[PDB]
Design a protein around this nucleic acid. Structure first.
Lengths: 220, 478, 107, 268, 98
RNA sequence: CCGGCGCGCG
């Protein structure tokens, strides 16, 4: 716990968990700052215990609203898919949904496995999308979803607000994407940087990107 | 006896060389080969003899046809029937039924229909009987592709018009129920299930031992989906009397872990309170999420149903209709029939919404401007119509008398499937005012259905009871 | 003699040593007579059945009985390809009356 | 008397691109017919010996043209009443504009998630969609998810036909027909459209035909010996298809479609 | 052949027949005695041209009139022709069943 | 050995 954080500081942070690391970082809550009114961090947690620990850690940092991005791999870890989305829904207000590394397994089925922990599926969610209306959760929380992590994290970055927070997890310091059998090159930190760089124009162009669907000016 | 067909043929040739009549020996050899279960060599020897100009006895012809059709050998049976008709013995309904027993399973209804057309428009001894109609109907309802409800309906009409010579049996009603269930003609399936109830076995025959998708389960599902709960209860009594356990296909579990026990009450496709949170992890684990055997509810490109419940029907299962809705529909259709036989200003905007407060001044304006942000019968009584019935003149009754005199139509042509098949119970389900739906009626029906499903081997889920002392009897706990 | 390049039917005209046309009105008369084998003669191996035209030339010179064509003439195969060019497939199937096996005829 | 049974049938049917490839397998790629000097069949051309056969098999061997963009079949779009319009339940004018004009369709597919409030067929181009969204979403990822919320041409039609749920179509048509009945010229014509739509959707379920085959991905090529006019129309398809793949723009996409329509059915 | 068809009325909804469907008179009467599922129909007079375009063979209709319209409608539904008529076998070059 | 135009015969 914190071995990577300790080594980098010794050779040469946010939350109370990193305070003890200082007393005694790539892919460990790497803060992405572009003079915005919020923050973006990257963690490698692909396990329910670590994800729960970090999601609890975000609450103690006083965020106004909690937005999370989660995924799961394919052909492996099939027995615990819905737990991350369950804990995120019970811990976050608006939660984006996507995959971590679909691999040969089709990401649509795994993304269906996400909604199984809440009483939804791809059929019901897509029927919600067709009617361009998403009724909120039981505890007042909101749910949006997208098959590809790219646009999902772009919208999550665009939804960074004042005193708000966005988590993108499952990859961390790893900078590869697993679709089918080819290991595509994909960096979460750089993509988050790009999303934070050009967030202004999308919001100022008359598009109400606050929720899915975006209220386009000429679309009514 | 030893099956040495070639040795028998050599002995027959030796007999022929010695100026002997080989017909009796040929018959004996064929019969022995059939008895010892050498149907291939028996068929070959019989065909050799028949093509040689030799004539067999009627019993041997019938035995060959029946055995070949029982073994599923239509080619040899057809060849032997052709040879028998060439020898001077014409085919009767027995041989035609034997042939039809194999054609009905070929997947092409046109073969069986060609045989049926040969029988129907032929001599008196070739006329179809109940078995022939059953074979042709089975061929049509189990077709590979295209719709055949029209063909089966016309065949049923032809069978009805032949009432003086033909009458149905259990298989007829089982096939008709299956056909009208796969095509979602539910009312006709209910009529023929009422007819089928009077036969012992009955629903057991309709079950088809689970084969052909198990049409009995389809009948139960079709009854459940349209909210025909009284008919569902009657079917449950039918299977209980027939010692027929409710099959798992009939007990399929809905999206929200419900079954036919609680699917037609006012919560539609939704769960009850149940007193606690739902354990979604247990649901995911028990559904096969550990070994990759789960059923993912994501739409896919293709002409296949995503819903496993629609498996078996031609164009998917009937749409979900609550018992409350079905009762209201039946109330409306009865009264539409009753009416037919008898003949023979800004405050106006408030009605488009829920009227929140408003009333004094400027509240109506602010609300109308902020509302844009969110943006006696006699059906089935043939006797009454027969009584009413009694250049063609323009007067309808004069015209009726004309067709009576010119023999165009007469009262002898006025009969339905009900009054020629002895459906005396049909008049008790018609020309009656439907019962208004009530909560007490619905809950008592739910209790009755739950008890009858439990006693039949079908276990309702906890969510089924939650919609409603019997809850704990199943091993549950709120 | 000489046949058309596409339809493979005998040519038209006295100057071209062509044959006489059996029109649809002539086909009606043959159907009224019930002469089903005269009609098939002038539909397959006197007009466009390439394989059966050559065998009729040989059998008649030796006098050894002309058999039925049983295949499709080049006018039907020509129509099938044209329907294929409109993204339409037309298949001829034979269903055995003995064992109900479906046979796809080459066309 | 037992009748001498004869069960012979022939059936037409809409063809699949895979069956077109099976016919050809063999793709015609060049519009050259014959050599001007040597009078020999040009390779990969309309009369190629490798594709079609040595100079009997040239009367039966088929080829195909690999169209870069899908083109709708004129018989199933322009003939009245339109089958594509009835199955998609849209007026013929908007479909024709989508295929022949510079119109883009909003929300062409459903079985994949979207995030936009774009509905209908917006005639004018979306100003934000031109620069704002692509420039914020870059190019590669934007093009990856491009063909899921806005599309145009016969590709949008094929996408709409591919993901159609026929059973849902039948149920919606039946419920709308009941609603109309329970309530007088086009109060009946709308009913007649509804009856025509469920009968059209019903036939697709029981057959092996796919409604997306109504838009062509490959173009079968007639054997050369059957076309010793039609050849000129085949060159145009190659003339404008090979131009289109060189670019990879909307105008050339329409030119390929018009070449196929003229080849398939003129005077319509 | 002119007076052998009836027209399903516009109010007859069932899974057996659809409104406006052209069905045979004998079939309509047979289904009337066997089913009570709103089998509503009225006698229709067809001309010798319209009757010839509502046959059981698409080859006979295609070779009669509106070839493109007949083939386009038929090829959408995988129509099957059982070659029971005289003209169908003439097209194939086979022996007519007469 | 392919199509158009013109003139004819029954």
């Amino acid at each position: 716990n914190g071995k990577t954080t300790t080594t980098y500081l010794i050779k040469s942070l946010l939350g109370r968990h990193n305070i003890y690391n200082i007393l005694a970082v790539p892919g460990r809550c790497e803060l992405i700052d572009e003079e915005q009114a919020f923050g973006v961090i990257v963690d490698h947690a692909n396990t329910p215990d670590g994800l729960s620990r970090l999601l609890d850690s975000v609450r103690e940092l006083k965020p106004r609203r909690i937005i999370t991005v989660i995924g799961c791999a394919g052909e492996n870890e099939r027995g615990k898919r819905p737990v991350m989305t369950k804990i995120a829904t019970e811990k976050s207000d608006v939660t984006m949904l996507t995959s971590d590394n679909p691999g040969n397994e089709d990401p649509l089925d795994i993304l269906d496995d996400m909604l199984s922990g809440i009483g939804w599926t791809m059929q019901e969610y897509l029927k919600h999308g067709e009617h361009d209306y998403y009724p909120p959760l039981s505890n007042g929380h909101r749910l949006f979803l997208h098959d590809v992590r790219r646009v999902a994290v772009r919208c999550a970055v665009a939804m960074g607000e004042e005193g708000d927070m966005v988590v993108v997890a499952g990859k961390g310091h790893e900078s590869y994407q697993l679709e089918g059998d080819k290991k595509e090159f994909y960096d979460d930190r750089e993509e988050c940087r790009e999303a934070l760089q050009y967030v202004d124009e999308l919001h100022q162009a008359g598009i109400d990107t606050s929720e899915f669907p975006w209220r386009l000016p000429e679309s009514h | 006896s030893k099956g040495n067909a070639q040795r028998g043929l050599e002995l027959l040739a030796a007999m022929e060389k010695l100026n002997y009549d080989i017909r009796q020996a040929w018959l004996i050899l064929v019969e022995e080969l059939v008895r010892t279960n050498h149907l291939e060599e028996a068929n070959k020897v019989f065909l050799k003899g028949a093509r040689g100009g030799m004539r067999a006895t009627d019993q041997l012809y019938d035995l060959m046809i029946e055995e070949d059709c029982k073994a599923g050998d239509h080619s040899n049976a057809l060849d032997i029937s052709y040879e028998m008709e060439a020898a001077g013995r014409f085919a009767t309904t027995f041989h035609f039924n034997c042939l039809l027993s194999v054609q009905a399973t070929c997947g092409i209804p046109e073969v069986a229909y060609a045989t049926f057309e040969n029988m129907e428009y032929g001599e008196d001894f070739m006329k179809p009987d109940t078995e022939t109609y059953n074979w042709v109907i089975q061929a049509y309802t189990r077709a590979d592709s295209y719709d055949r409800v029209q063909d089966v309906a016309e065949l049923l009409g032809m069978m009805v018009e032949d009432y003086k010579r033909v009458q149905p049996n259990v298989k007829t009603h089982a096939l008709l129920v299956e056909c009208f269930t796969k095509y979602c003609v539910v009312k006709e399936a209910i009529r023929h299930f009422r007819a089928l109830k009077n036969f012992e076995g009955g629903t057991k025959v309709l079950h088809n031992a689970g084969n052909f998708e198990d049409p009995l389960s389809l009948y139960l599902r079709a009854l459940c989906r349209e909210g025909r709960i009284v008919e569902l209860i009657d079917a449950l009594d039918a299977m209980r009397r027939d010692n027929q356990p409710i099959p798992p296909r009939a007990m399929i579990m809905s999206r929200k872990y419900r079954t036919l026990v609680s699917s037609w009450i006012e919560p539609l496709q939704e769960e009850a309170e149940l007193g606690y949170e739902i354990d979604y992890l247990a649901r995911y684990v028990e559904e096969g999420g550990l070994t990759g055997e789960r059923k993912r509810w994501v739409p896919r490109r293709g002409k296949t149903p995503l819903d496993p419940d629609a498996a078996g029907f031609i164009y998917s299962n009937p749409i979900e209709t609550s018992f409350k809705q079905r009762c209201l529909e039946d109330w409306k259709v009865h009264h539409r029939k009753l009416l037919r036989t008898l003949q023979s200003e800004l405050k106006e905007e408030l009605e488009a919404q829920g009227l929140p407060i408003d009333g004094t001044r400027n509240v109506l304006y602010q609300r109308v401007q902020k509302a844009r942000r969110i943006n006696k019968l006699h059906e089935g009584d043939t006797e009454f119509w027969k009584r009413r019935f009694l250049w063609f003149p323009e007067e309808p009754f004069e015209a009726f008398k004309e067709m009576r005199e010119r023999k165009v139509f007469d009262v002898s042509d006025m009969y339905t499937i009900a009054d020629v098949w002895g459906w005396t119970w049909e008049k008790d389900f018609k020309n009656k005012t439907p019962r208004r739906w009530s909560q007490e009626w619905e809950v008592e029906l739910a209790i009755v259905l739950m008890a009858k499903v439990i006693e039949l081997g079908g276990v309702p889920t906890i969510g089924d009871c939650a919609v409603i002392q019997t809850t704990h009897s199943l091993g549950y706990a709120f | 003699g000489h046949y058309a390049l596409v339809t493979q039917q005998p040519l038209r005209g006295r100057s071209k040593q062509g044959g006489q046309r059996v029109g649809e009105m002539e086909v009606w008369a043959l159907e009224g007579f019930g002469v089903a084998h005269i009609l098939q003669e002038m539909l397959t191996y006197k007009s466009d059945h390439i394989r059966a035209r050559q065998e009729v030339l040989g059998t008649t010179i030796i006098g050894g009985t002309i058999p039925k064509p049983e295949d499709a003439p080049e006018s039907f195969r020509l129509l099938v390809r044209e329907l294929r060019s409109l993204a339409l497939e037309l298949n001829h199937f034979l269903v055995s009356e003995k064992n109900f096996q479906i046979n796809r005829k080459e066309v | 008397m037992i009748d001498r049974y004869k069960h012979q049938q022939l059936r037409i049917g809409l063809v699949s691109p895979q069956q077109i490839s099976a016919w050809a397998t063999g793709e015609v790629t060049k519009p050259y017919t014959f050599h001007y000097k040597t009078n020999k069949p040009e390779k990969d051309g309309l009369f190629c010996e490798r594709i079609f056969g040595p100079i009997r098999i040239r009367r039966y061997q088929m080829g195909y043209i690999k169209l870069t963009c899908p083109v709708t079949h004129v018989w199933y779009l322009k003939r009245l009443p339109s089958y594509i319009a009835n199955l998609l339940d849209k007026p013929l004018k908007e479909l024709e504009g989508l295929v022949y004009c510079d119109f883009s369709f909003a929300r062409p597919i459903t079985k994949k998630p979207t995030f936009l409030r774009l509905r209908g067929s917006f005639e004018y181009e979306i100003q934000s969609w031109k620069y704002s969204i692509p420039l914020f979403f870059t190019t590669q990822g934007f093009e990856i998810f491009r063909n899921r919320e806005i599309s145009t041409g016969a590709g949008a039609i094929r996408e709409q036909l591919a993901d159609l749920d026929l059973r849902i179509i039948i149920e919606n048509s039946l419920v709308e027909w009941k609603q109309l009945g329970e309530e007088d010229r086009k109060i009946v014509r709308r009913k007649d459209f509804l009856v025509r739509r469920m009968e059209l959707a019903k036939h697709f379920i029981r057959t092996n035909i796919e409604p997306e085959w109504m838009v062509l991905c490959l173009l079968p090529v007639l054997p050369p010996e059957l076309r010793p006019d039609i050849n000129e129309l085949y060159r145009r398809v190659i003339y404008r298809n090979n131009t289109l793949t060189d670019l990879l723009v909307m105008c050339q996409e329409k030119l390929v479609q018009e070449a196929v329509d003229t080849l398939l059915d003129n005077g319509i | 052949q002119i007076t052998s068809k009836v027209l399903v009325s516009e109010e007859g909804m069932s899974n057996v027949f659809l409104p406006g469907e052209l069905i045979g008179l004998l079939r309509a009467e047979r289904t009337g005695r066997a089913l009570e599922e709103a089998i509503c129909y009225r006698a229709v007079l067809l001309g010798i041209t319209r009757a010839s375009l509502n046959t059981q063979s698409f080859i006979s209709e295609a070779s009669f009139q509106e070839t493109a319209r007949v083939l386009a409608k038929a090829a959408l539904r995988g129509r099957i022709d059982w070659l029971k008529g005289l003209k169908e076998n003439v097209v194939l070059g086979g022996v007519i069943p007469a």
